[PDB]
From a paper:
RSV polymerase (RSVpol) is a protein complex consisting of the large protein (L) harboring the RdRp, polyribonucleotidyl transferase (PRNTase) or capping, and methyltransferase (MTase) activities, along with four phosphoproteins (P). The RSV RdRp is a nucleotidyl-transferase responsible for de novo RNA synthesis for both transcription and replication of the viral RNA genome. RSV P protein acts as a crucial component to control the efficiency of L, interacting with nucleocapsid (N), and guiding the newly synthesized RNA into the L active site during transcription and replication. The RdRp domain contains the classic polymerase subdomains, fingers, palm, and thumb.
To gain a comprehensive understanding of the interaction between 22 and RSVpol, we conducted a detailed structural analysis of RSV L+P complexed with compound 22 using cryo-EM. This led to a 3D reconstruction with a global resolution of 2.72 Å. Subsequent analysis allowed us to model the RSV RdRp and capping domains, as well as four partial P proteins. Within the map, we observed a distinct density corresponding to compound 22, situated within a novel binding site adjacent to the palm subdomain of RdRp. This binding site featured a deep hydrophobic pocket located in close proximity to motif E (comprising residues Met866-Asn876), which formed a β hairpin connecting the palm domain to the thumb domain of the polymerase. The subsequent pyridine ring engaged in face-to-face π–π stacking with Tyr423. Hydrophobic interactions involved T-shaped Pi–Pi stacking of the indoline ring with Tyr861, as well as halogen bonding between the sidechain carbonyl oxygen atom of Asn812, a component of the conserved catalytic motif (Gly810-Asp811-Asn812 [GDN]), and the bromo atom. Major conformational rearrangements were observed in the side chains of Lys885, Lys871, and Asn812 upon ligand binding, enabling interactions with 22. When superimposing the compound 22-bound RSVpol onto Apo RSVpol, a notable difference was observed in the RdRp domain of the RSV L protein: the supporting helix and supporting loop, which are missing in the Apo structure due to their flexibility, became clearly defined.
Author numbering:
A (entry chain A): 11 to 133, 184 to 618, 627 to 677, 690 to 1460
B (entry chain C): 130 to 186
C (entry chain B): 131 to 228
D (entry chain E): 131 to 157, 174 to 199
E (entry chain D): 130 to 184
The structure:
Amino acid sequence: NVYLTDSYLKGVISFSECNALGSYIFNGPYLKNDYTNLISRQNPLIEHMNLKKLNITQSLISKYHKGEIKLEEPTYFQSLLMTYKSMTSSEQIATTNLLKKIIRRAIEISDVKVYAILNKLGLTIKTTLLKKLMCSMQHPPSWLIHWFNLYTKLNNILTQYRSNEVKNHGFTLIDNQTLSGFQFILNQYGCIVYHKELKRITVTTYNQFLTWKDISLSRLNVCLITWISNCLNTLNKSLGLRCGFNNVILTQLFLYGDCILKLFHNEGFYIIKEVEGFIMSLILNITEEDQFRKRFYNSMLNNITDAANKAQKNLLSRVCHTLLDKTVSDNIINGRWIILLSKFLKLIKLAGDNNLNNLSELYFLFRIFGHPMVDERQAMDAVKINCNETKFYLLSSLSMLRGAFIYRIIKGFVNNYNRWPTLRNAIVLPLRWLTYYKLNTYPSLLELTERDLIVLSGLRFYREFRLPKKVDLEMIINDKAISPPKNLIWTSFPRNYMPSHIQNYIEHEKLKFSESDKSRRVLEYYLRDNKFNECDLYNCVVNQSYLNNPNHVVSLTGRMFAMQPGMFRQVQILAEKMIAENILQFFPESLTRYGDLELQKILELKAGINYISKCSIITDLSKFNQAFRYETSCICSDVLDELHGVQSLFSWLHLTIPHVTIICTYRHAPPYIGDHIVDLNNVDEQSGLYRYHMGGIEGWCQKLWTIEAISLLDLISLKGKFSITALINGDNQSIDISKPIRLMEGQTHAQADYLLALNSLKLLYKEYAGIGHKLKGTETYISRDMQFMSKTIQHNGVYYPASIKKVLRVGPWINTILDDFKVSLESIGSLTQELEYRGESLLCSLIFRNVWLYNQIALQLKNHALCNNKLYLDILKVLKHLKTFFNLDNIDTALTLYMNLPMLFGGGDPNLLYRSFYRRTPDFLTEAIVHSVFILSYYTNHDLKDKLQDLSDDRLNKFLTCIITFDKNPNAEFVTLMRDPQALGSERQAKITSEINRLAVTEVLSTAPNKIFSKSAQHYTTTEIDLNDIMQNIEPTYPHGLRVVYESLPFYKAEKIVNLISGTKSITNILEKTSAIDLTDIDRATEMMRKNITLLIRILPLDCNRDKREILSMENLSITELSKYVRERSWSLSNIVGVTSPSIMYTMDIKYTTSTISSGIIIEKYNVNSLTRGERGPTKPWVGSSTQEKKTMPVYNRQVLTKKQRDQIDLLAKLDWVYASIDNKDEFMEELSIGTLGLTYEKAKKLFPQYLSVNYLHRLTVSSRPCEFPASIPAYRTTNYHFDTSPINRILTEKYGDEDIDIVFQNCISFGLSLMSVVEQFTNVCPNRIILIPKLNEIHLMKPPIFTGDVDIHKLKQVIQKQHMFLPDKISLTQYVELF
Amino acid sequence: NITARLDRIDEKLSEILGMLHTLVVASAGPTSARDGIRDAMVGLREEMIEKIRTEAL
Amino acid sequence: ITARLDRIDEKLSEILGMLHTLVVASAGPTSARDGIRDAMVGLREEMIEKIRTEALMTNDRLEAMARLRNEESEKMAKDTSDEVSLNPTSEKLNNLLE
Amino acid sequence: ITARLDRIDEKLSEILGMLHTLVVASAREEMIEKIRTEALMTNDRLEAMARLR
Amino acid sequence: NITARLDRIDEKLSEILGMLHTLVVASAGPTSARDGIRDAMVGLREEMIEKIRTE
Ligand SMILES: CN1C(=O)C2(CCN(c3cnc(C#N)c(Cl)c3)CC2)c2cc(Br)ccc21
């Protein structure tokens, strides 16, 4: 059992852990005067005792007790470390030479792609651009060498510790020479830092060391990116990023932030967090006008000074009676800190340069200074006052809130079902509302009165939606921790921190609970349940078994994360799922869309929104929940309860939580229990433990409060007589307010907009205070002409990104499990694509990616924590093979080639060349082959403007011959093509972790005490055999139809769970209650990594190209026919249809001048300026949405069915559409409809959508086909160009004629747009027109095939019967009766 | 005139009904669930009656 | 018969006037922090003077008084004011910045 | 026209009485009858569908 | 007609008195009243099952 520790910070820095460690070591209150220090000095942990008993620690303690060294706080040593410049030795030459080598190698690797692109466009280094850049980047600046040296040292320390702790458990690293001046005692349970010439010592944790390393890496990445971008913009102004920073100012900013952190304390982060507002002010001074920006500036100054005063107060209060009482500087008492702060702020303004690009990119500064230590009991005490407060309402306010909610629901039902919901109370309606009810209409907001809402608040409803009767295992199972029951909560703390009676009680009382109740994680909470039943949640909800339950706790872990036992968590998840499923259709303002292009969609549709005065209000709703009560939430929860026919399912929180004790269950923060007290509801209320919580826990019930906020906004719009357009994306509310006004004499539009904003703000404050929510001036602001939403900035239609903030953590082993090489390469590439998708710079992203890929491959494989240097020897033998096969001259050239060929064939390039022009593709193999051809053009000197020719250089012929020649060895063709329609077979592609870990997961699950998992895992293999036998005799193979068949069976849901479980570390020790990794898992991972690295030796054999004296001839060669042949040969199949598609980057030839040929698509520039980056045009933003099917929907009552049934119906309808040609389709459909839905085919066919589209090969909606095809540029820029695709349909109908062809025109338009962008980047001038002419050699017909064969019904029945425990709910007779 | 004067008593009674129902719903809070009288103030819905029917026949 | 419709209208007006001055206090912990308390309904002035005698325990009682009465406190009056006024430290920092 | 309005007036008087009794008291069979009646009328809606099978 | 407009008022008045009865009964402080309510609801359920099982 091996212990692998973290390499990056994934967690929080603990206040109580550091407090306890330092208090035990130095024998006194270290950071605070908590109970943590008392119990830590009374009964220390064994790891703390081990750290204190060392020989160097005893020496340092002796020095400290003699008054010879002074104790400090970790921020002091952070400031010391980040200024370390004792780098004056023969150590100054080694670092500089290493950095120069890395830079040279990165440019030499990028040269190949730059050459390929410049050749395709028609525009050791072969390019003049990169030769100039290499001449310009020969001497690294001092501020970059500083951070590179610091990061190298800290990373070396960490790598040494991690390796030696993998080899030996219980290893303490004692380092004195790596960093001259400092002395490190590093471990997994603590860290001791000592400075000898300053006579300083500090004690901290392992996560703080990880944070220091992350800080040095972030500052290194900032310096690298700005240096590369500056050197690029010095050659061509369109080549780099849109920002223009100066790195001396950035060094000064780092220094002054460190000075603020050292001066105040841990309490200084509160101050830096405020400076975000400061930057926002600098933005408004550019975009807004006098009154709005003056208001924001004054509020910002007030916020900052209040934060600083509170920080000083709390700092002076905390360290009074601790061992740090003489560490407070004198510049805080006399108030001279302001000067420091002023300088800091001034630098930020000097860094902004009065530019929106700099000011928008400058938000990386708040990910540069580290993370604070979160005090847990204090965070608990901060909200106890807000959630124990009594609120006072007027009955009219609650009546109107309920009426607005009911109005929204009535309007939604009328719009979505042509029907008022069924009322059981229509007696209470007046005549004018009875008319609306019986006519099935509603009035508008302009015709609505405040009395109408009070009248509507009296209506009661009948059940409209139905609850699922069987639990969905995919929504309740995840990879998180779970809270123990109330009687087993004392198991959250070490046994040393508990009194004797609590220990005796725990041991005597663990004998009356299940093995799943004693669990500490969700997965094993469900796996150990030997009495599981899928109708347990439904019975709990219907019987209300969660009310008044004596097993209920709330456990907090800080930013706070709360948890409860499993039953209540089930009920919570079900309530939120029912809201998301049935109700959010009536509230189109609630969003959950976080994404690259989605936020741009939202900002575009926001910008699209005798005078009409306008204004905007931005509000932060993070603390929104603490103010809610039963009276304010359940007046609408009751409407939802009535709509679903249940009681108190959406009202569970405010009915259950007020009777629970809220407790902090941190490991190092236990409460003080008085002797002879075991029950938690009898322990004294103290810091970190209380009762009578009214108000709601953050995260639980968020959608309810969102839709209630929307209803309140409707009420405000009614009361104020103006129009409102609202958007809520998480915890951020944006309101656009519009009102028709008649301007006075001399009044300007600005003053009218300002008056409207002020009056709307008054009305909003009053209406929010009416329901008990007191808005603060720190959470709300008003503006008029700047679109802000979710930390995204748009102005005048131009979008301003923050890419540098997101590329800060790119490094060696990021985002992997067990230090996987392939996943690390993939994550590096995907994270560096953002300097091109958002930053609009191809070459900067490319060079940064190559820097870190070279560092990770050529420098960090020798230091693997578990695979000591075997992967590096594999890499070297692969490089030797490549050097022999391609007749290269060095291993350097071999590595340059290896880093440029795709990962599909076993190489090391994670970013294919087509993703610089369009984001989606329908066929990966053709893109891989085209990328390989383009890359090998660098060594074979082939021209990408001519055609495929046979020349004297036969490297490409050799490559293609080895690609199409191999030994067929298929196995399990159809189930593999079911779970991945793009798989190759015959071991022609690399393997992923799921395929490797599947069998291990199933053998671990075969022994689980839960029968629903045991039977599934015991029948897995025979189910796979049957599933492969089902669709084997249907000869024309359509892997997308195979996917549709696969998704309509319960084995799909069975496989989701296995794919989820196969993503943990130490799959074998899941049911072993251990945090250590088994050696079998390490061996599996090691052998997988080695096979995947050496794949390129088996794919490109030196064996006379597999005794193939015949070589491939390129005269009239089609890459797409070759791809289709390669794909068919690897599965031993005669015909596979609907998977092969040409490559737009290869098919289209690019011209700039117009000619008499008159072919291909045309892209023109409608802008008038020469350059386009940062501008907007008169066109509509291009979204490459695909064309779906045309289908008619039958008329029946849909709300009678759940969502799983409505999904299974669509699946069976697609199956009836696609496989309508097979010979036993009637028996097939009867079996499917009676096995999965419960009805016969005759009754089920009445609910199937009928498809009017004939060619399903062209328009089929599967999860394995791209739904849209966007470009590789931001949306706002697509508005600068105009396209016409008409000259190509004139030539495509004379060669085929009214026939479907395999080509995506969306990707053609995207290619054209990104081509405009890239040509402007590389030439510093945007072309007027481009013309794309297709190669007709690559375009083929797409006609729907006629299927022949018989489906095996016996194997279908076997598959349905073996995995019956994952089937959805059958459609009953009671339900089918109400369907019509 | 009698009908136009009776068509206002109805609109006043409807407002009284809305206010009193909101009060009834807001008064059945955590103490009512703790004492077990909340179903006597909000009503029995479809699921409980279906359970009663299944345990009856 | 209008002499009876008038006595019906006066009663309806009385009920609707006594229902538009009702105030609800949310349920919370009792005095001395043991148990939960029920939600309380009562006329506006009775609830206000119950807040003044602090029979209902709460902080920020001044804004409670000024909000149950349809009035505007000065805190909320400057929260939504035309111009924002600095603080002593804010003017010190603003002088340092200019 | 003469008795009905007086019934309305008596019911309004009783309403005012009970509303005073409620709003000054800060510190069962009719209710159970209504609960039973509406629960039976909901069971009737359930039985209509159960018999429609 | 007028008789229908008086029937509506009668129904609404009965509903108002029902709501008021609920509000005033539920507001009884002593535990005796809230115990009687749950005992009566216990009864009601297993007396409703009687009328359901009869037909
Ligand atoms: C008073 N007030 C503010 O000053 C700000 C605005 C500016 N803001 C940020 C923070 N981070 C980013 C990043 N990336 C960006 Cl782009 C803006 C911080 C808070 C704010 C936001 C919201 Br919603 C509600 C009220 C306020």
